[PDB]
Amino acid sequence: MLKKKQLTVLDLHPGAGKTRRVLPEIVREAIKKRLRTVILAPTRVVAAEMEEALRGLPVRYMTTAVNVTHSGTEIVDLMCHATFTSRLLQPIRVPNYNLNIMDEAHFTDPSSIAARGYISTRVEMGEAAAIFMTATPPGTRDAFPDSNSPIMDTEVEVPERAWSSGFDWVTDHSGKTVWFVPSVRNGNEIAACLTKAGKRVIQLSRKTFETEFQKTKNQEWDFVITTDISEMGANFKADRVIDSRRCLKPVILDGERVILAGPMPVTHASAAQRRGRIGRNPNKPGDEYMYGGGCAETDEGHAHWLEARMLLDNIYLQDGLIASLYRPEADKVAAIEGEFKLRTEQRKTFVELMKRGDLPVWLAYQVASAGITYTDRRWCFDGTTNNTIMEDSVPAEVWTKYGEKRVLKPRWMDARVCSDHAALKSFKEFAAGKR
Ligand SMILES: CC(=O)Nc1ccc2cn[nH]c2c1
């Protein structure tokens, strides 16, 4: 498994022990063979869990999520998927790791897809070995894989709005439920309806994940309302999963704007990962999985695969060569390899708009490729009237860095900058020149 020129997919079912049992064995063998190794965690929460399973082993934690004193002699590095891709893009020397281990390798965020493409290209070239750890490899068609204990699967209508009647089974439950919703806004409505009925609810999403996940272990709760981020190795002490079976899909229209389409069906991989939250304790059979729709291959034409190509086109590999996407997920986008390659100055602006600007990859690319510098925000206000960003049914307004009140009307409209109150707040600060 650790021999050069080989990519292995460790596809044990959810809860089979990939992270707590297999991962330490692989690390011990890699250190014995003196292989310079990278361990890639999807989130800071998973990085903290990996430190518990690897505790004592000489691993260098390149994250502030772990408070450890490194000896300086570690040959095994651990960092998040995004950090790896970020360091590849930046003018920082990244070691040419002999062994590349990716945990939760089904993660479909652009930086995870780009990391898989880069690593799999190095393996194809015969320069490295790689191990992708996931119960649901790219292309899986089984939404009901094996579990540690039997699960009661039930197809049922699941509410996506507040309800006054017709869903007694939801509140007539004395255990703990994890509920996957298609968006932050949809979760807010269900959480308020559940709170009004006397339930204690915790809400999780990409931006609030590390802080709010702590509350699932520090306090008593009845429901966790979460977006698709909890498919990435997040574990709960629950006995029921309610799954809407729906997600939002970013879609690029005519190469000029990004909309959040749907809600629409999740992939079979996503459904299996959501269901996989329960049935994990062999001593507690009977966990329930209630699902509200079917699965579909909605990753085809999803903006994240296009954004992954924008990232890989700007990562140095060898001379003019460019890393391809990982073969099983390469048909999800119809881009020309190298079509997003930027010149040195524009590439630096592209990186900074993502790293400091916190802009989506697609939007960062439109700005940098237009020859606009990082601190130049005139583009946030000179778009067409149909690009007006709306806040509570009235045009959003900001004071520019010049002291003038202006309506937010970006030249390129990416729906992810205003998909929720928190996102629009961060975009307003960016348009105002506050970061
Ligand atoms: C993959 C493909 O269809 N090409 C494409 C799609 C959308 C955009 C937006 N900006 N550049 C683009 C290039």
Residue 237 assigned to a binding site? no
Strands 177-180 and 390-391, how do they pair? unpaired
Q: List the structure tokens of 55.
A: 């505790």
CA–CA separation, 367 and 66 (whole Å): 35
Residue 215 assigned to a binding site? no
**CA 325–ligand 1 middle distance (angstroms):** 16
CA–CA separation, 408 and 70 (whole Å): 47
SS (H, E, C) the chain: CCCCCCEEEECCCCCCCHHHHHHHHHHHHHHHCCCCEEEEECCHHHHHHHHHHHCCCCEEECCCCCCCCCCCCCCEEEEEHHHHHHHHHCCCCCCCCCEEEEECCCCCCHHHHHHHHHHHHHHHCCCCEEEEECCCCCCCCCCCCCCCCCEEEEECCCCCCCCCCCCHHHHCCCCCEEEECCCHHHHHHHHHHHHHCCCCEEEECCCCHHHHHHHHHHCCCCEEEECHHHHCCCCCCCCEEEECCEEEEEEEECCCEEEEEEEEECCHHHHHHHHCCCCCCCCCCCEEEEECCCCCCCCCCCHHHHHHHHHHCCCCCECCECCCCCHHHHHHCCCCCCCCCCCHHHHHHHHHHHHCCCCCHHHHHHHHHCCCCCCCCHHHCCCCHHHCCEECCEECEEECCCCCEEECCCCCEEHHHHCCHHHHHHHHHHHCCCC
CA–CA separation, 274 and 268 (whole Å): 10
**CA 36–ligand 1 middle distance (angstroms):** 37
CA–CA separation, 319 and 310 (whole Å): 18
CA–CA separation, 194 and 205 (whole Å): 18
Overall residue count recorded for the chain in this entry: 435
CA–CA separation, 121 and 111 (whole Å): 15
Q: Using the atom order of ligand 1, give the atom closest to the CA of residue 339.
A: 13
Strands 287-291 and 240-243, how do they pair? parallel
CA Rg, the chain, in Å? 22
Packing angle of the helix pair 303-312, 110-124 (nearest 10 deg): 50
- Please report where in the chains the tokens 């999800």 appear, as a residue: 332
CA–CA separation, 195 and 223 (whole Å): 10
Handedness of CA 332, 336, 338, 339 (dihedral sign): negative
**CA 276–ligand 1 middle distance (angstroms):** 34
Q: Using the atom order of ligand 1, give the atom closest to the CA of residue 334.
A: 1
- Please report where in the chains the tokens 């880069």 appear, as a residue: 118
Q: How many CB atoms lie within 10 A of CB 85?
A: 27
Residue 89 assigned to a binding site? no
Alpha carbon nearest to ligand 1 atom 1, residue = 335
Nearest of 157, 181, 161 to residue 169 by alpha carbon = 157
Please name the amino acid found at residue 82. A
Which are the contacts of 386, defined by CB distance < 8 A and separation ≥ 6? Answer: none
Residue 3 assigned to a binding site? no
Q: Are 244 and 180 in contact (CB under 8 A)?
A: yes
Q: What are the angstrom distances between the C-alpha of 433 and each of 271, 342, 356, 427, 429?
A: 40, 24, 12, 10, 6
Alpha carbon nearest to ligand 1 atom 8, residue = 255
User: Phi first, then psi: what are they for 407, rounded to 5°?
Assistant: -80, 135
Q: Are 79 and 41 in contact (CB under 8 A)?
A: yes
CA–CA separation, 243 and 225 (whole Å): 10
Alpha carbon nearest to ligand 1 atom 11, residue = 255
Q: What are the angstrom distances between the C-alpha of 409 and each of 61, 95, 97, 255, 366?
A: 42, 42, 44, 18, 15
Alpha carbon nearest to ligand 1 atom 7, residue = 255
CA–CA separation, 231 and 277 (whole Å): 8
CA–CA separation, 37 and 405 (whole Å): 52
Residue 64 assigned to a binding site? no
Residue 18 assigned to a binding site? yes
Q: Are 272 and 309 in contact (CB under 8 A)?
A: no
**CA 331–ligand 1 middle distance (angstroms):** 14
CA–CA separation, 413 and 260 (whole Å): 11
CA–CA separation, 346 and 339 (whole Å): 14
Give Dmax over CA atoms of the chain in angstroms: 64
What order do you get walking across the sheet with 59-61 strand by strand?
A: 7-10, 129-133, 99-103, 37-41, 76-80, 59-61
Q: What are the angstrom distances between the C-alpha of 143 and each of 197, 328, 375, 411?
A: 32, 18, 46, 41
Q: How many CB atoms lie within 10 A of CB 64?
A: 8
CA–CA separation, 355 and 85 (whole Å): 11
CA–CA separation, 46 and 56 (whole Å): 17
Residue 254 CA, chain-centre distance (Å), reads 25
Residue 301 assigned to a binding site? no
Nearest of 366, 345, 353, 347 to residue 88 by alpha carbon = 347
**CA 184–ligand 1 middle distance (angstroms):** 27
Q: Which of 254, 257, 302, 306 has most ligand 1 atoms within 8 Å of its beta carbon, as the pocket-test mutant?
A: 306
**CA 107–ligand 1 middle distance (angstroms):** 22
Q: Using the atom order of ligand 1, give the atom closest to the CA of residue 366.
A: 10
**CA 334–ligand 1 middle distance (angstroms):** 8
Query: Residue 101, CB half-sphere, CA atoms under 13 Å: how many?
Result: 25
What order do you get walking across the sheet with 257-265 strand by strand?
A: 246-253, 257-265, 413-414
Which are the contacts of 149, defined by CB distance < 8 A and separation ≥ 6? Answer: 279, 280, 281, 282, 283, 284, 285, 286, 287
Query: What separation, in Å, do the N-terminal and C-terminal C-alpha atoms of the chain show?
Result: 45
Residue 159 assigned to a binding site? no
Q: Using the atom order of ligand 1, give the atom closest to the CA of residue 309.
A: 1
Alpha carbon nearest to ligand 1 atom 13, residue = 255
Whether the upstream peptide bond of residue 150 has omega within 30° of 0, thus cis, is no
Which are the contacts of 254, defined by CB distance < 8 A and separation ≥ 6? Answer: none
Q: How many CB atoms lie within 10 A of CB 157?
A: 10
Q: What are the angstrom distances between the C-alpha of 292 and each of 105, 238, 251, 266?
A: 26, 19, 23, 11
**CA 407–ligand 1 middle distance (angstroms):** 28
> Ligand 1 pocket: which residues have CB below 6 Å?
252, 255, 306, 333-335
CA–CA separation, 203 and 242 (whole Å): 14
Packing angle of the helix pair 44-54, 209-218 (nearest 10 deg): 60
CA–CA separation, 213 and 205 (whole Å): 10
**CA 370–ligand 1 middle distance (angstroms):** 15
Residue 289 buriedness (CB in 10 A; 0-12 / 13-18 / 19+): buried
